[PDB]
Design an enzyme around this catalytic site. Structure first.
Site, PDB file in Angstrom:
ATOM      1  N   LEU A  95       0.902  -1.147   0.000  1.00  0.00           N
ATOM      2  CA  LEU A  95       0.000   0.000   0.000  1.00  0.00           C
ATOM      3  C   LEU A  95       0.940   1.195   0.000  1.00  0.00           C
ATOM      4  CD1 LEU A  95      -2.340   1.865   0.318  1.00  0.00           C
ATOM      5  CD2 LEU A  95      -2.446   1.352   2.734  1.00  0.00           C
ATOM      6  N   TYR A 139      -3.992   1.645  10.845  1.00  0.00           N
ATOM      7  CA  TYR A 139      -4.794   0.542  10.338  1.00  0.00           C
ATOM      8  C   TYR A 139      -5.950   0.180  11.258  1.00  0.00           C
ATOM      9  CZ  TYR A 139      -1.480  -0.084   6.513  1.00  0.00           C
ATOM     10  OH  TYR A 139      -0.708   0.167   5.396  1.00  0.00           O
TER      11      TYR A 139
HETATM   12  C1  LIG Z   1       1.073   5.202   4.888  1.00  0.00           C
HETATM   13  C2  LIG Z   1       0.575   5.838   3.579  1.00  0.00           C
HETATM   14  C3  LIG Z   1       0.173   4.693   2.602  1.00  0.00           C
HETATM   15  C4  LIG Z   1      -0.679   6.714   3.856  1.00  0.00           C
HETATM   16  O1  LIG Z   1      -1.064   7.614   2.774  1.00  0.00           O
HETATM   17  P1  LIG Z   1      -1.626   9.016   3.043  1.00  0.00           P
HETATM   18  O2  LIG Z   1      -2.418   9.476   1.822  1.00  0.00           O
HETATM   19  O3  LIG Z   1      -0.510   9.991   3.370  1.00  0.00           O
HETATM   20  O4  LIG Z   1      -2.564   8.935   4.250  1.00  0.00           O
HETATM   21  P2  LIG Z   1      -3.643   9.831   4.840  1.00  0.00           P
HETATM   22  O5  LIG Z   1      -5.041   9.324   4.480  1.00  0.00           O
HETATM   23  O6  LIG Z   1      -3.423  11.237   4.295  1.00  0.00           O
HETATM   24  O7  LIG Z   1      -3.466   9.851   6.355  1.00  0.00           O
HETATM   25  C5  LIG Z   1      -2.196   9.543   6.859  1.00  0.00           C
HETATM   26  C6  LIG Z   1      -2.127   9.122   8.299  1.00  0.00           C
HETATM   27  O8  LIG Z   1      -1.160   8.052   8.467  1.00  0.00           O
HETATM   28  C7  LIG Z   1      -0.019   8.524   9.262  1.00  0.00           C
HETATM   29  N1  LIG Z   1       1.327   8.259   8.615  1.00  0.00           N
HETATM   30  C8  LIG Z   1       1.721   8.350   7.272  1.00  0.00           C
HETATM   31  N2  LIG Z   1       2.998   8.043   7.054  1.00  0.00           N
HETATM   32  C9  LIG Z   1       3.486   7.731   8.312  1.00  0.00           C
HETATM   33  C10 LIG Z   1       4.818   7.302   8.832  1.00  0.00           C
HETATM   34  N3  LIG Z   1       5.897   7.132   8.052  1.00  0.00           N
HETATM   35  N4  LIG Z   1       4.971   7.061  10.210  1.00  0.00           N
HETATM   36  C11 LIG Z   1       3.912   7.216  11.063  1.00  0.00           C
HETATM   37  N5  LIG Z   1       2.642   7.606  10.706  1.00  0.00           N
HETATM   38  C12 LIG Z   1       2.478   7.854   9.290  1.00  0.00           C
HETATM   39  C13 LIG Z   1      -0.198  10.060   9.359  1.00  0.00           C
HETATM   40  O9  LIG Z   1       0.202  10.616  10.501  1.00  0.00           O
HETATM   41  C14 LIG Z   1      -1.698  10.325   9.111  1.00  0.00           C
HETATM   42  O10 LIG Z   1      -2.443  10.495  10.343  1.00  0.00           O
HETATM   43  P3  LIG Z   1      -2.854  11.927  10.792  1.00  0.00           P
HETATM   44  O11 LIG Z   1      -4.220  12.292  10.130  1.00  0.00           O
HETATM   45  O12 LIG Z   1      -3.050  11.899  12.327  1.00  0.00           O
HETATM   46  O13 LIG Z   1      -1.775  12.978  10.406  1.00  0.00           O
HETATM   47  C15 LIG Z   1       1.649   6.836   2.969  1.00  0.00           C
HETATM   48  O14 LIG Z   1       2.300   7.648   3.996  1.00  0.00           O
HETATM   49  C16 LIG Z   1       2.822   6.175   2.167  1.00  0.00           C
HETATM   50  O15 LIG Z   1       2.621   5.815   1.004  1.00  0.00           O
HETATM   51  N6  LIG Z   1       4.076   5.951   2.810  1.00  0.00           N
HETATM   52  C17 LIG Z   1       5.170   5.284   2.157  1.00  0.00           C
HETATM   53  C18 LIG Z   1       4.920   3.765   2.029  1.00  0.00           C
HETATM   54  C19 LIG Z   1       4.377   3.094   3.284  1.00  0.00           C
HETATM   55  O16 LIG Z   1       4.797   3.380   4.419  1.00  0.00           O
HETATM   56  N7  LIG Z   1       3.378   2.099   3.017  1.00  0.00           N
HETATM   57  C20 LIG Z   1       2.760   1.302   4.058  1.00  0.00           C
HETATM   58  C21 LIG Z   1       3.339   0.449   4.798  1.00  0.00           C
HETATM   59  S1  LIG Z   1       2.234  -0.759   5.555  1.00  0.00           S
HETATM   60  C22 LIG Z   1       1.486  -1.840   4.309  1.00  0.00           C
HETATM   61  C23 LIG Z   1       2.539  -2.461   3.423  1.00  0.00           C
HETATM   62  O17 LIG Z   1       2.596  -2.159   2.210  1.00  0.00           O
HETATM   63  N8  LIG Z   1       3.382  -3.314   4.032  1.00  0.00           N
HETATM   64  C24 LIG Z   1       4.480  -3.990   3.326  1.00  0.00           C
HETATM   65  C25 LIG Z   1       5.686  -4.118   4.282  1.00  0.00           C
HETATM   66  C26 LIG Z   1       6.981  -4.365   3.521  1.00  0.00           C
HETATM   67  C27 LIG Z   1       7.297  -5.467   2.766  1.00  0.00           C
HETATM   68  N9  LIG Z   1       8.564  -5.340   2.224  1.00  0.00           N
HETATM   69  C28 LIG Z   1       9.102  -4.147   2.616  1.00  0.00           C
HETATM   70  C29 LIG Z   1      10.370  -3.568   2.322  1.00  0.00           C
HETATM   71  C30 LIG Z   1      10.647  -2.304   2.879  1.00  0.00           C
HETATM   72  C31 LIG Z   1       9.696  -1.615   3.715  1.00  0.00           C
HETATM   73 BR1  LIG Z   1      10.143   0.113   4.441  1.00  0.00          BR
HETATM   74  C32 LIG Z   1       8.426  -2.202   4.005  1.00  0.00           C
HETATM   75  C33 LIG Z   1       8.117  -3.491   3.451  1.00  0.00           C
END
Ligand SMILES: CC(C)(COP(=O)(O)OP(=O)(O)OC[C@H]1O[C@@H](n2cnc3c(N)ncnc32)[C@H](O)[C@@H]1OP(=O)(O)O)[C@@H](O)C(=O)NCCC(=O)NCCSCC(=O)NCCc1c[nH]c2ccc(Br)cc12
Ligand SMILES: [Mg+2]
Length: 166
Positions: A95, A139
């Site tokens: 995601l 989540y």
């Molecule tokens: C988390 C998302 C998807 C959310 O999108 P947004 O559109 O910004 O979300 P919004 O609807 O605006 O709301 C965001 C809320 O999430 C919170 N949030 C976002 N980013 C972060 C962060 N880095 N830390 C803490 N909180 C966060 C934020 O504070 C906000 O709440 P708020 O309203 O109180 O401010 C975005 O920040 C993003 O794309 N981040 C980069 C990618 C990411 O972190 N994806 C999700 C990870 S969990 C699901 C997933 O894909 N897991 C795979 C695990 C995995 C497998 N292999 C790997 C290799 C390396 C790594 Br590293 C990881 C893996």
């Protein structure tokens, strides 16, 4: 004759390049690795495109979810590259939202749409994923419940497994 302002649709292998570019900045730039490499995304977008969802703005991908089906209570190392056709669990492998579009509801909106979309298919009874400790509360806003340390290994990072009943 024109590019839509906002379009939500399931992905196809041709969207493979776009999603990988997003991952390079969302995951690789931060950990040196990513959930799905180009070959793994093509894989899932080939056998189970219906388990994917993407947000396009003016013809460009800005957010995506790539999943597959899993047939076991908990996630394991092999679930990383598998699609169990008879599974009842929607496994969200990745995601992510494009760097220039975060923090404005996109991820939340895509996730809810994804949940209902996949939850529309009666076979799918649950949604599962791995996530960093800091995103657990995020989540939970969706019905997911922390289910302990995930068993999956990736470099040195730790993950909590989240389970959501559909
Ligand atoms: C988390 C998302 C998807 C959310 O999108 P947004 O559109 O910004 O979300 P919004 O609807 O605006 O709301 C965001 C809320 O999430 C919170 N949030 C976002 N980013 C972060 C962060 N880095 N830390 C803490 N909180 C966060 C934020 O504070 C906000 O709440 P708020 O309203 O109180 O401010 C975005 O920040 C993003 O794309 N981040 C980069 C990618 C990411 O972190 N994806 C999700 C990870 S969990 C699901 C997933 O894909 N897991 C795979 C695990 C995995 C497998 N292999 C790997 C290799 C390396 C790594 Br590293 C990881 C893996
Ligand atoms: Mg070391």
């Amino acid at each position: 004759h024109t590019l839509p302002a906002n379009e939500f649709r399931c992905l196809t292998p041709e969207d493979a390049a776009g999603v990988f570019e997003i991952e390079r900045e969302a995951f690789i730039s931060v950990s040196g690795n990513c959930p799905l490499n180009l070959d793994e995304v093509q894989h899932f977008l080939t056998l189970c495109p219906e388990l994917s969802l993407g947000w396009f703005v003016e013809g460009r991908l800005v957010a995506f979810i790539i999943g597959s089906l899993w047939d076991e209570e908990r996630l394991t190392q092999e679930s990383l590259a598998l699609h169990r056709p008879r599974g009842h669990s929607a496994h969200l492998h990745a995601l992510a939202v494009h760097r220039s579009f975060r923090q404005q509801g996109k991820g939340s909106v895509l996730l809810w749409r994804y949940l209902h979309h996949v939850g529309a298919q009666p076979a799918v009874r649950r949604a599962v994923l791995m996530c960093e400790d800091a995103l657990v509360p995020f989540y939970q806003r969706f019905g997911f419940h922390p289910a302990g340390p995930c068993a999956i290994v990736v470099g040195s990072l730790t993950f909590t497994e989240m389970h959501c009943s559909l």
